Amino acid sequence: IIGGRESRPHSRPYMAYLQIQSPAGQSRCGGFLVREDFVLTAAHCWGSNINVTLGAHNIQRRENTQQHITARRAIRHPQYNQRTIQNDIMLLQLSRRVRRNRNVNPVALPRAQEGLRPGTLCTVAGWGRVSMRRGTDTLREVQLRVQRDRQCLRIFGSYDPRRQICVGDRRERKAAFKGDSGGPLLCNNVAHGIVSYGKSSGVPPEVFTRVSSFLPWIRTTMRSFK
Numbered sequence: 001i002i003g004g005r006e007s008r009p010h011s012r013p014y015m016a017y018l019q020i021q022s023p024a025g026q027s028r029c030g031g032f033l034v035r036e037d038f039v040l041t042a043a044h045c046w047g048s049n050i051n052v053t054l055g056a057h058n059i060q061r062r063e064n065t066q067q068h069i070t071a072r073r074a075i076r077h078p079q080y081n082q083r084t085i086q087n088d089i090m091l092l093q094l095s096r097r098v099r100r101n102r103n104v105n106p107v108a109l110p111r112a113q114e115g116l117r118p119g120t121l122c123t124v125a126g127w128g129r130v131s132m133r134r135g136t137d138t139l140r141e142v143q144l145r146v147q148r149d150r151q152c153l154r155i156f157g158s159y160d161p162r163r164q165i166c167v168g169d170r171r172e173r174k175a176a177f178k179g180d181s182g183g184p185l186l187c188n189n190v191a192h193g194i195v196s197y198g199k200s201s202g203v204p205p206e207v208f209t210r211v212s213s214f215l216p217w218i219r220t221t222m223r224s225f226k
């Protein structure tokens with residue numbers, strides 16, 4: 001998170017810290033608990049192994065609030081496209097249910113057909129970088145404004161307003177960045193978006209997955225692999 005602040009510890013108890021292991025080494029993503037057995041995140045965060053840490057604030061320290069659960073399945077949308085980054089959405093079926101408590105509990109999703117309009121102020125949180133090339137170990141958050149479609153259509157290779165949200169005012173140095181992918185865009189305490197990607201410079205606007213568009217996929221998947 002660029003241009004944000006440290007979150008109050010455990011104030012976002014749905015936040016999931018993901019460590020993604022692959023032949024390229026280790027990478028970081030966020031995610032969010034949507035039921036006691038499922039974390040929602042971005043498909044590009046897939047790797048050979050995905051370890052989930054729930055209940056965290058400082059991910060460089062053991063904390064008694066933490067729960068460590070490996071993903072039993074990492075279920076990517078069937079139309080995820082690595083080149084265009086379309087359909088950048090994935091569900092992690094946890095290998096066991098969380099122990100629900102005030103530090104670990106799920107966040108609401110939009111209702112069916114519930115939209116999200118340009119101009120809405122939302123919050124994004126994560127453990128990603130705080131500048132183009134510096135990181136952090138504690139959870140941070142920043143408020144960003146939903147942009148009109150045109151802002152992202154003009155500057156990205158592939159953008160679809162039906163499935164994506166365009167987020168962040170270009171004049172403000174405030175953005176999700178590397179390490180934040182998969183985390184939620186919270187608008188009035190509902191997770192309407194998933195951090196996907198932006199420019200390598202960190203200059204907004206950036207692209208989020210529009211959760212409301214994928215509710216059928218989310219619901220069916222959660223039922224099948226409950």
Ligand SMILES: CC(=O)NCCc1c([C@@H](C2=C(O)[C@@](C)(c3ccccc3)OC2=O)c2ccccc2)[nH]c2cc(F)ccc12
Pocket residue numbers: 020027028029044045046085175176177178179180181195196197198199200206
């Ligand atoms: C290819 C691309 O569009 N890069 C943009 C830089 C960027 C990324 C990139 C990215 C990761 O997410 C990460 C940490 C990674 C994690 C897990 C597995 C692989 C890689 O390392 C990366 O470099 C990225 C990579 C692939 C697909 C989408 C995004 N995440 C962001 C999020 C933001 F909020 C703003 C800008 C970006």
Ligand SMILES: [Zn+2]
Pocket residue numbers: 009010057063065
């Ligand atoms: Zn704590």
Ligand SMILES: [Zn+2]
Pocket residue numbers: 053068
């Ligand atoms: Zn740990």
